[PDB]
Ligand binder design. Sequence first.
Ligand SMILES: Nc1ncnc2c1ncn2[C@@H]1O[C@H](COP(=O)(O)OP(=O)(O)OP(=O)(O)O)[C@@H](O)[C@H]1O
Ligand SMILES: Nc1ncnc2c1ncn2[C@@H]1O[C@H](COP(=O)(O)OP(=O)(O)OP(=O)(O)O)[C@@H](O)[C@H]1O
Ligand SMILES: Nc1ncnc2c1ncn2[C@@H]1O[C@H](COP(=O)(O)OP(=O)(O)OP(=O)(O)O)[C@@H](O)[C@H]1O
Ligand SMILES: [Mg+2]
Ligand SMILES: [Mg+2]
Ligand SMILES: [Mg+2]
Lengths: 250, 478, 55, 470, 121, 240
Amino acid sequence: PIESPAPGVMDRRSVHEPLQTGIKAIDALVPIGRGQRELIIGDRQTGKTSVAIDTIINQKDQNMISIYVAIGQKESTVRTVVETLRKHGALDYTIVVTASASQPAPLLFLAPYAGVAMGEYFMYKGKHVLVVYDDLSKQAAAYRELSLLLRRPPGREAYPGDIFYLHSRLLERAAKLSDAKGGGSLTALPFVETQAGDISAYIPTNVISITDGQIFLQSDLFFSGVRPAINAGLSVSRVGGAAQIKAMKK
Amino acid sequence: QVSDVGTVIQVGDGIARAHGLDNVMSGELVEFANGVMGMALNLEENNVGIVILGPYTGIKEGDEVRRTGRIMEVPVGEALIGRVVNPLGQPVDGLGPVETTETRPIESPAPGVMDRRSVHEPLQTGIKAIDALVPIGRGQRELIIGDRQTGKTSVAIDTIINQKDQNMISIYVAIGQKESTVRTVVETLRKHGALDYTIVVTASASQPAPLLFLAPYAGVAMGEYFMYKGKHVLVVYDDLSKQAAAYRELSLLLRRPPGREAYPGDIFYLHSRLLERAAKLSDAKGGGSLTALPFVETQAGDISAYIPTNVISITDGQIFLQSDLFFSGVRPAINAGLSVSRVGGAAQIKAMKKVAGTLRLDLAAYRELEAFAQFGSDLDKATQAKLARGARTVEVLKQDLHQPIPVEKQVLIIYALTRGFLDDIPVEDVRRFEKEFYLFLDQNGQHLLEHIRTTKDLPNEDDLNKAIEAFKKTFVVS
Amino acid sequence: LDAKASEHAARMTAMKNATDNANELIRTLTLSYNRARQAAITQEITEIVAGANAL
Amino acid sequence: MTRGRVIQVMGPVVDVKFENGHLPAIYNALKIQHKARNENEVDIDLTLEVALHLGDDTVRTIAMASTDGLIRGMEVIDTGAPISVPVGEVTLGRVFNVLGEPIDLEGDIPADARRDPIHRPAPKFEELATEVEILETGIKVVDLLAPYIKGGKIGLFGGAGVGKTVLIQELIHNIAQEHGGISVFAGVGERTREGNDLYHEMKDSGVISKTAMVFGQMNEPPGARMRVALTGLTMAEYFRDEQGQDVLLFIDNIFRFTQAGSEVSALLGRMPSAVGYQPTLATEMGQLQERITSTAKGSITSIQAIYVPADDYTDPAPATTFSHLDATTNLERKLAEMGIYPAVDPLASTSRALAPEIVGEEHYQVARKVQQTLQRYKELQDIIAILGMDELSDEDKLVVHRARRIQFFLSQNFHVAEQFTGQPGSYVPVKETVRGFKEILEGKYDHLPEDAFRLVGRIEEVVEKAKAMG
Amino acid sequence: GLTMAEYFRDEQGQDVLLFIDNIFRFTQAGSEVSALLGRMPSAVGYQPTLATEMGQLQERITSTAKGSITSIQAIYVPADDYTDPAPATTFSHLDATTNLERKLAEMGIYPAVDPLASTSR
Amino acid sequence: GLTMAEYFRDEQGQDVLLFIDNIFRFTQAGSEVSALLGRMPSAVGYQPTLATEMGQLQERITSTAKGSITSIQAIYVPADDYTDPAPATTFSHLDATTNLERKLAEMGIYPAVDPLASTSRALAPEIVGEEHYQVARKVQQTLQRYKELQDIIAILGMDELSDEDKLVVHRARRIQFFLSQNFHVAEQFTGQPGSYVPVKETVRGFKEILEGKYDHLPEDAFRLVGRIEEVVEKAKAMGV
Ligand SMILES: Nc1ncnc2c1ncn2[C@@H]1O[C@H](COP(=O)(O)OP(=O)(O)OP(=O)(O)O)[C@@H](O)[C@H]1O
Ligand SMILES: Nc1ncnc2c1ncn2[C@@H]1O[C@H](COP(=O)(O)OP(=O)(O)OP(=O)(O)O)[C@@H](O)[C@H]1O
Ligand SMILES: Nc1ncnc2c1ncn2[C@@H]1O[C@H](COP(=O)(O)OP(=O)(O)OP(=O)(O)O)[C@@H](O)[C@H]1O
Ligand SMILES: [Mg+2]
Ligand SMILES: [Mg+2]
Ligand SMILES: [Mg+2]
């Protein structure tokens, strides 16, 4: 089913297994563990998709299934991403779910739930899954369009009242199951596109209030040669560090 | 039968709802029981929504509404010349009825893309600053924008007066003005003789909002009758901001959703419809043209406001007037820095074109150096020459009230200023020098005057030099 | 005399660059004010629309 | 049956009632034709677009013209398909009005002409091209520092009187000459006099024989202004889908499309979104932009001018539009007054294509080196006024000496600029311009006078000019 | 009050002075009436009919052949905001305006009229 | 949870620690469900009954004669807007508040409590002591003066400030850094073990800083330490 209850309090285990993204500026100072959900946030043309593609490609050695969910992306961009995945061989273990900007609003609203429901199937078998949501801001815009068409009164910035519940319900299904539930895990990397780096906007704050950290990419750094564009001032991992190899931690 | 009659079921705030009128057309005029006109705006399934165009206190529930069979139009013809009239064509000055035999609808499509021609004819406003810095061509529409009490109405009246010998018809549309103000404007026009070719359309602040919303469209409809016959028309809308306010009131009374800055959604469409009907017709349609001078009032000089931005996006330029310049004794108050005409300059005559550039440069230069005013003498080149010439330019560009001057005299005085014949004249005497120069020209330089007036070109430079030197020989500095 | 003229030059350039800094800060603050006010405008429009709709 | 009657008229919105089981589909076209039976009526000729199904066999529509004169009870006819405009060779050199009806006096279009629906789903994921390709425009600045992409969207910016129109004409000329394609210009909610001026300029330049124009300007209703872009796009799509060509599509102002959509939504009665825009803003923009893509047999690339309200690049309409753009070219009044044409800013312009994966290592290195040189010159221009020209170091003198020649060599002579300058134009291939800029970087031409680079095509013409000068 | 004043110039041909305590409170009362009647609020919550109400009040204060009425009106500016709709739509009907400053009042200069912000035709 | 705590308060007369993880989500859920119940929307989309619904919950969490309840609540602030109705209404229900700030969090000084927005009902001379009250007020005054100087510092530069303003800035930056602390639970992010600082130690250390004793130490010595002696230890490690 699209809508399913999240794992309970006693069904979960503390994250203790590293997710090696293959990028120094992440694996060194903002580590990501399995079962974590880490936010990738930045402006347009900053490398958000490139970070996810590199992370997905790096998982060839590891025993992990990858799901790339594109919401509101351009179809040419999705085609080129699929071609890079095919060239690097990541299509041996990858599922691509797409809903372009030409699709009606309900499909944009619905895509991430389909992705996470596809992930849960492997998660509950004791396997490890990685899920990438290419935009949650565009999902929020689609849901706002749906609510206004249904004549529900808007709240702050015309968003409906349960814009928080939407994202929390989506992202709360990513978990690290315990040995009693099988030991499987699901990892989420939601994306948020800010406007002029305003980290204090409504949707960025809502998504920050859910995930276990955030990786902030700065356009000022991306331009002028700092190409990975990591901003160590605003990037942190709340659960990471306990899921980092001893050598790197040392 | 209920096909040609209807009974009112709701009355409120100038909006009426009537049952019946099965054959009424959208946009039609209807007749109430007591003689008040109305528009059938919304044709719903079981009732008709009517916008009242007069005092609605005399309309109750149950009184009959009669159909007329005519989509809303206004009377047109040469008989409207020299009369002040309401937006519906009913005279308000007395003097009996206006006898006309032709009409033209208020809504009418703008001239097509293939019906137009490039603007090539000058429109002499009679103001030195406008005719030199921001020329206006026939068929252009140019925005005039400023704050309260800056001189926009005075500029419009001066432009209308200056058109006496030209082959143009002027139309003055006053929206939201005080009745005494409109009366005074009409009296000045009559005193200066402009009523021989001028129509005044008035909609005072005490009128219902739909009349204010309709007035500029009635003015344009009156102008188009002359325009399509091959004549040239000048139309002035005194307050598009007040027209927009009246439209916002009407839209809110009809309970339409608001838009940006609380103005309605199609506020841009309103002024686009209004200002797109002014054009220069091609030769195949007859060489007619209609030129428009919309007005917009700002708040503390803020241009970034919604309505100013919309109108600047619509029109072909802007004339910006400054409150500080107006208060500092510069009465035309035109800021040549921000002001710009995009289609004009092509229509400017050759004599003015050959001389306007140096004055443009001088006036542009004498604005940044005014910051360095606390100290007097940095350089002779930077301070002495530049500041002296700029101050003399500011003095010559000043103008008195209701006294336009001809283009050839403007050209001659601007040439004298630019070439340096004012270099050794004190600043305080420049206006007297200009006045006595015009009198001396009338006395002796009829040959130069007629040469300019016939060829639209500068006369022989050496002869002009010797004439100005001959005048300076007699002019006394005191 | 040389030192007095040096004092004049130093104070002149100090006032100049102070004015430049002040105008930069004014640009930033006024533009910030202007980005802020559109949120209030859209909030009041949203409130009016909701009030009209709920009835 | 296929016949209905009008039951409500409220401005541009018209409600029509049909027989049960015979309602038209969404986005279909309905025709109203009427003859005044007596003096209390007027003749009517109108087209309606279906928008909703209100229930009770009633359909709500949007009119493409003024609704004055409508009477409750007039007969309505169903066409059984959306708006259809003529496509093919007959559309070249003609001007249309969003309904496909010609505006110029060359006559009507015969009824046997093929017509295509306005509304159409975007091309499938299967049909798209798998690789990114560069559209060779033949203009040195664009081909070096801001490459174009087949199927990409380009945003154009610039002040008044800088060269946007002449640049558009030169782009059409170069594409038609070398790549064998055509162009379609779609004005949207702009000045009618500007449209007439553009028509006359195209006729003067001779570009008009290779282009089609649809205008639907400011004075048109929102229903027409909201579909001008779609009709222009659907006449453009024919040549790419049926003849496999590379096509240009110019949209005069994409912001007016969004504004017309918002106006239409307010009439439909939907709840206003964040800043008064329609709730369907993103969906409408996606449905317009996603049809401009490169396919297996052809491509459409679009040059779009975008107005930004209050210069706020975070406003919802510019924010939504910018997500689709692939490149950006900015014009400079400073360069225009300096005499550099086509006056493209070599530092404000940005492009997604300029990457080693797409354009090549050699091209990328040359371009980045040029940008660094120009940035260093920009920095040194302050120190020149701070201290003086002679006080700068020798390496800074060399940097300035290279930068002047680079900035001058960025200029080019346009084919359509002959009417002004008196000099024929030049089409410079990307390989040739890369080689020339590498040669200028390496110091091979430091001895030449800097003015011989002023306005010229290939690098060999520069040494020819220097030879003729001295 | 206007009805009481109009008689002296209509039937008796006098010159009358009409002093109005505060236009701002008149506009506030109009806005309250509009909100009670349930109309859609204008720019900052005012009534849509603000301009027409102000016009129908002020336009009756005019000079005619029989007599003249001159009016001295006091306006209240909230938080020094002259952009406020009530003063903004009041400005269009005035021949002379006077600006009073708490800055001048604190120094002790009564009547505290600003000599540069006051204009008259 | 409140019902469970009330039994221990009443039927047993026992002291209760009550922790509420995020009380704002209660009003958020109320606003989510309010629209479907047929109520007209209030300002910024909240329910008309925001104040009464929150009051009916808050006034149950009190200490009575038979038992005492001390409650610590975290109150999320949506989009960093402290004027939002939900944060604004809950202010009147509290005795002591501490306002965390993103600005202080970004500079790296945790716990990032705003030293001027935070207030408590217990900061009175007869409750905490004369010396404590005077030291706290002096610290707040210095921080406010440093806050006011931030425009003149940015524009005219640090050089042109007077003799006293420079001393105020010098003391204020060190005070702002010394307000930071290393936490026991933060040892997961850093190897520093953390500390527990008594009130006497805090008051004496801040008094010593105010008297100008430690003006010769660098600013960075004061970040993330416990008692005042650790500042001297860190400076000596730095080499002083
Ligand atoms: N590590 C890198 N090295 C070089 N180029 C890079 C790197 N990461 C990203 N880029 C470049 O950055 C550009 C945009 O990157 P990307 O598409 O990942 O951005 P984005 O934030 O997903 O953009 P959008 O808003 O279009 O979705 C591309 O030209 C890509 O080649
Ligand atoms: N060139 C001038 N010389 C002298 N007085 C002038 C000149 N231009 C305008 N004035 C005077 O300045 C005042 C401005 O009035 P005007 O009607 O021209 O302004 P306005 O911008 O239309 O203002 P309002 O908003 O009050 O209608 C009037 O008293 C007018 O007589
Ligand atoms: N390549 C060129 N060669 C010669 N002259 C040029 C060139 N490009 C521009 N110009 C000059 O600049 C003028 C501006 O032309 P154009 O109409 O393209 O400008 P624009 O920036 O699009 O203006 P507008 O906003 O009025 O449409 C031309 O009329 C011509 O005089
Ligand atoms: Mg991306
Ligand atoms: Mg006036
Ligand atoms: Mg152009």
